[PDB]
């Protein structure tokens, strides 16, 4: 390969720029040339491409978001979209593509290979819900963002002896809520991958009140439901002064943590190695603490799960 | 004086512990003895008092919340409440009282002096809405908490080219939203002390879109209204992809900033100086960068205002 | 005025970019045009100037350092330097100059006015040692950086029951060490503006050891001397397990705090107001919490002092 | 088992309290009783033990250092020490021991089992240099602390176009410097496990200067040598304006990161599981992202290594 492309698609995540930086630096060290695609898939169609020099990626390792931007491109589900895209590609003589993003982004990389455009996917999401990897780029960062909030909430919850329901991100995966809850020392964690009984939850809170703890923290993954409904329920059933906080999009931004920076550097470098060595239609990840690569097709057919033992431990550590 | 008391009332704020620490250390250096009142006014009634040794206040300067707790005590509006309180006081031979808290807390200190219990108020609120001081204890901290959020939001807003409405605290004062907005480089700030015309707001956003900025940040003080209503309005009228974030109680917790720590140390020390020197029914503050003290009565009759010139500047700095 | 210039000189400080941003935005709102001077004075000589558009200053409010760079320019002490500079100025038709920086930078602004080039100085230093202002741009930020370190040191000092000597910046002013020490709850603060007796320092440490506190934190402004000498002295005279930490240049970088951002916005805006209204050879500041401006000459003839009462309080708050 | 003990020994690390918290909560859930040993081994000798109730470990998950303190106990190398210790143990009827700490701490746990006192070791060090685990408790935290510094240094290094040598901790392992350097986007990393040639280092810096980058960051693990010697060397050989910063003990303190909190919770819980189930003389860890346990003897005979491929990548990512 003489020339590759790199794009970010799906919801941005902290560490995407460190990823971009390794793709660009890896490729060039190898003498290959890198072209950035702006606005993700949508930009790819609109032929929104510009070469990236080694310095275009200096001073970005520590920044959140993506300097390549991102957008929702429904028009790419289409053979027409895909054609227009493949055209744009060829028009710049971009031979290969590194896609950094969600799973909606992986599908696109799949479709592109089926049309003979070698693509490698890099998992960038705060969610951790991407098959093929233990951890996605941006998850560690989001986690630290949430525990930052929890730490703060804890101060005021303590002061006023109140119960707080904190809604975190992950529409389909409980990683954020699970790791957060654990690290935060939350009395209750509601994730989608585990059954919960509101009676039990209540029982445990009352019991904790008794054991002398007047404040309490409850984490709820948006996937399960609304922070407001649980707060309402919890308050009606215990009589505790209850407050609800929805973290929101703060979970998406910020300067990536060291782990997210090391992870994104390693994975972005690897994706380039695959393109050169001709492997295409692969997705990178980290499993059992080792750098791996899978067929997108077989990884996409795979499912996202959480360590139920971790979830259990959560319950044993609550007072 | 041989023995004083210290309490925290109203919503907790970062820096209350540094305040507690200076009251305790100041007093003892002076050979006076300090008694802590737990759960604020409510605890004062229930005679929830315990002496504080010099070391009871070691390792708290950097902690948020208040180690004395706080509670809402409606029963204190009452002569009966006030009696029960004054009784409890005398029963421990506590001669004077340092009250750290909101204005609801100042009233209580007023009522107590009218019954001959020398009280000095210390402004502790994230709000900055307390007459008699340029700055209250906890405001700087809350500010840094909000800009922390804004910084994050900015990353994702940039990435996806979206408009964000961020709701911050202050039910009656726009300090948080004003300083935040300014420091955050927000395109629009909605505070209660300034008239706004939704048409103009819109005009400025569209105009900014034109000048080439595809993302935008709007700050709204809860006092003005709901982040959701403005978001709805802004989106309907511009067609911009709009998202809303409510910061909530995270604004209340955290390890106080250096300024909040220096401020709370200085003011808590001063309040003790007043008690000893017999001045009672006073409130402390910082005005024109100098340590001052006022009659609670005349400070409570005074009103809270913001620097309108600062608000103006906000508009000139928006692209 | 139709066209102004802006430069940063002396040691960079967090908040310089927010300053740059207000100068650029203020001026343009006023219809004036802004030219950036790169590498400070040195760049000014080498005619290293480039116009700044409204967007050249978007996304910098939150960044540390200065996008204009800075350098040491000894050659400017010279009439020749000054000529070459004034030439460069005129060659671009830049009529006025906003200088952001230390006092070495103010002198240069003085010399420039004496040659009829209207200049306004903006105080940018982590030091706080600039006459004409209570606070300089970057001081609050440096303070939060130091207390961040102190907080950490406290954890390990506590764990191991050790004494730590922490050297902070300020070669001629004790502001950093004084505010830090206070906010940090340091047992001892050594600043240059106050006499200290090593015997007393020792006495207080031993006494504190006795009162039951096994760890201790000592802050020393580089101006007084080396962290290593004091550590050596303190250890030899108490027998306490002593460790020394030199913070260094970390004090200079980072994303400016809210206060530093609001301060730099307000002051940079003001400096522009002065240039337009013809006032030149002035320096801006904040005194008694109000925006002021002075003649550089009379402010430079003035001296930097610290609130000795604050220093005293430091001693009364130590256990 | 009816009663266990828990201690912290060696240099404190962020996450030790979260570890303490899981040991205490795990054990009690299991109906076993926990006794804390203060001042590590030294305290164990001096019979400095006190039971720990479920609430003694509330509000510590987020704190750095160790609420159990730690000390250097040379006297424990001794059969006499060990006897005095085993005596103290029995005198409280403490049957098992959870040791959290360095490897110096593991030896002690070994010696204790050889005397029939079932002990389980938990890896707590900022260093990551402990065999039997991919990661030790406190490493992630130290990493984030260093990149925090690097980020700051980068701002000032950029502003002034200078080269900085940053000395980090790890006397025998390069993990900190390696991960830091990578995450920090350092131009050079000097670790002990890899050969370096000062000529090459120089070559790369000059070359980078050429490619247009005027600032540079160099990380050096204390293990390799002094930041001052390298700075001196680098400056003499390039002519670049060079500055040196030694991070020091700040690397040891702070509120543990989410990963350090989850890791310490999981491992501390596991160590208790081993004690109950009779396994003693084991050490816990995380390998290939799975919770494991080893014989202390065979893990101590094993060696600490770094991923050389990671080190390589470091070089390919430098401009």
Swiss-Prot record, chains A, B, C, D:
Pathway stated in the Swiss-Prot or TrEMBL entry: Carbohydrate degradation; glycolysis; D-glyceraldehyde 3-phosphate and glycerone phosphate from D-glucose: step 3/4
Residue sites binding substrate per the record: 125-127, 162, 169-171, 222, 243, 249-252
Enzyme class: transferase
Family matches, as Pfam families: PFK
InterPro entries linked to this entry: ATP_PFK, ATP_PFK_prok-type, PFKA_ATP_prok, Phosphofructokinase_CS, Phosphofructokinase_dom, PKF_sf
Cofactor(s) the protein needs: Mg(2+)
Location in or out of the cell: Cytoplasm
Binding site for Mg(2+): 103
Source taxon at top rank: Bacteria
EC number per UniProt: 2.7.1.11
GO molecular function: 6-phosphofructokinase activity; AMP binding; ATP binding; fructose-6-phosphate binding; identical protein binding; metal ion binding; monosaccharide binding
Keyword Cell cycle among record annotations: no
GO biological process, one term: canonical glycolysis
Binding site for ADP: 21-25, 59, 154, 185-187, 211, 213-215
Active site residues according to the UniProt entry: 127
Homology family: Belongs to the phosphofructokinase type A (PFKA) family. ATP-dependent PFK group I subfamily. Prokaryotic clade 'B1' sub-subfamily.
Subunit structure: Homotetramer.
PANTHER family xrefs: ATP-DEPENDENT 6-PHOSPHOFRUCTOKINASE (PTHR13697:SF4), PHOSPHOFRUCTOKINASE (PTHR13697)
Note, other: In the R state the 6-P group of fructose 6-phosphate (F6P) is bound by His-249 from one chain and Arg-162 and Arg-243 from an adjacent chain. In the T state a conformation change moves Arg-162 away from the substrate. Glu-161 takes its place, hence repelling the phosphate of ATP.
Function: Catalyzes the phosphorylation of D-fructose 6-phosphate to fructose 1,6-bisphosphate by ATP, the first committing step of glycolysis.
UniProt protein name: ATP-dependent 6-phosphofructokinase
Organism: Geobacillus stearothermophilus
